[PDB]
Amino acid sequence: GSSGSSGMSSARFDSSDRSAWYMGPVSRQEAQTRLQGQRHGMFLVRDSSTCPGDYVLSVSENSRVSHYIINSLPNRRFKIGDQEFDHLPALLEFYKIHYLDTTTLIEPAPR
């Protein structure tokens, strides 16, 4: 049971839930089709390819997929662009209110 709920918060997703946002096994070609045309706000984090270890936060905005690369800091931290946080699930929660470029993080793409 306990299926369904309401609230006055556009952003309603678990940041500490990789199985909710982390797509791990996902390539750009895919991630794109998942955030291509999708409602503005959709996002997801998959294993980066260009660089080993790094990640890529694919977001949906401007009728495109805003790929927000997440640099891997040596201090066990992540640096997304020109900002830094405690970890992956520590930056997405801080963006739930802040607008990256023209929008904010609403909810992670569907499985």
Swiss-Prot record:
Family statement: Belongs to the CRK family.
Protein's name in the database: Crk-like protein
Quaternary structure and interacting proteins, as annotated: Interacts with tyrosine-phosphorylated EPOR and INPP5D/SHIP1. Interacts with DOCK2 and DOCK5 via its first SH3 domain. Interacts with phosphorylated CBLB and IRS4. Interacts with BCAR1/CAS and NEDD9/HEF1.
Signal peptide: none
Residues covered by the SH2 domain: 21-109
Origin: domain of life: Eukaryota
Function: May mediate the transduction of intracellular signals.
